[PDB]
Amino acid sequence: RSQFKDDFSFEKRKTESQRIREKYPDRIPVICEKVDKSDIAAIDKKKYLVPSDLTVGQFVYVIRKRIKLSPEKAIFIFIDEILPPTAALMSTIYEEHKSEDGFLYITYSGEN
């Protein structure tokens, strides 16, 4: 389960996602947390506003640069416990996978 969902009730989350989407219609509100029992690095930022025209692969690149992962290591990103295709658009992914509160929940692991 997500920590963000445990920290804030549905009302707060829905209000926030609606406000975000109304203020930045070109951006996608993403919550990105580390797999609980994984090994690799975890950072401070989990709240992202990533451009809708970005692909999944480009986003993966972005977070690799953010966490400063070593170029030899893998990083597997899960959405609803499945691995999304790298060539897929973030807008498509969002329309298909957005949560009831209007956020897109993303998990990542070093091993999978």
Partner: peptide, 22 residues
Amino acid sequence: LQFEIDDEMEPLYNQAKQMRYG
């Protein structure tokens, strides 16, 4: 609840937009 545009991220986004893969 602290959801704002990060200036520490925008350059990365603009960098990634040019970085196409397969």
